[PDB]
Amino acid sequence: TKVEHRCTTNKLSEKHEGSFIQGAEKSISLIRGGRSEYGAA
Amino acid sequence: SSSRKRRSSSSSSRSYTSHTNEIHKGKSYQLLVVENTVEVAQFIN
């Protein structure tokens, strides 16, 4: 008597994670009149 | 794999296995201020 049993198996996996943020601000201001202590403020 | 003949026999197994990861981060922040003060505005010579 002769017997033979055989197998092959394969597996794969992946994962990904991502983030981004962006900000921009501008200010423009003109003061005319004041004491420059509070014209500054 | 496993094999038997008659008595004699042999058997085997395997795992190739592998993994990879990466990360990155980048950040930049840029500021400008320009300011003028005056206390006399035409000074005229």
Side-chain angles (χ1 to χ4, degrees), chain A:
Chain A
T1 302
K2 303 177 178 174
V3 179
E4 176 163 316
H5 174 63
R6 180 270 180 178
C7 195
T8 182
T9 304
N10 197 83
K11 198 171 185 278
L12 174 149
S13 181
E14 300 187 342
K15 170 176 182 181
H16 302 74
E17 180 172 29
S19 172
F20 171 109
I21 65 170
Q22 165 171 348
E25 287 185 318
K26 296 189 173 72
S27 311
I28 303 178
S29 178
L30 292 88
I31 279 189
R32 305 169 80 263
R35 282 179 62 258
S36 299
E37 183 168 26
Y38 291 108

Side-chain angles (χ1 to χ4, degrees), chain B:
Chain B
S1 182
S2 310
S3 192
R4 182 161 288 110
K5 304 182 183 177
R6 74 193 289 183
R7 188 177 70 180
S8 66
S9 62
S10 181
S11 190
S12 178
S13 68
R14 178 176 300 103
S15 179
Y16 176 75
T17 284
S18 177
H19 170 92
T20 291
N21 296 351
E22 302 185 40
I23 287 176
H24 178 280
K25 308 187 179 180
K27 173 188 178 182
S28 187
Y29 183 40
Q30 316 94 31
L31 319 182
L32 285 165
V33 176
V34 298
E35 188 148 0
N36 292 277
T37 78
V38 313
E39 306 91 61
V40 169
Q42 278 279 28
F43 71 78
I44 314 175
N45 286 313

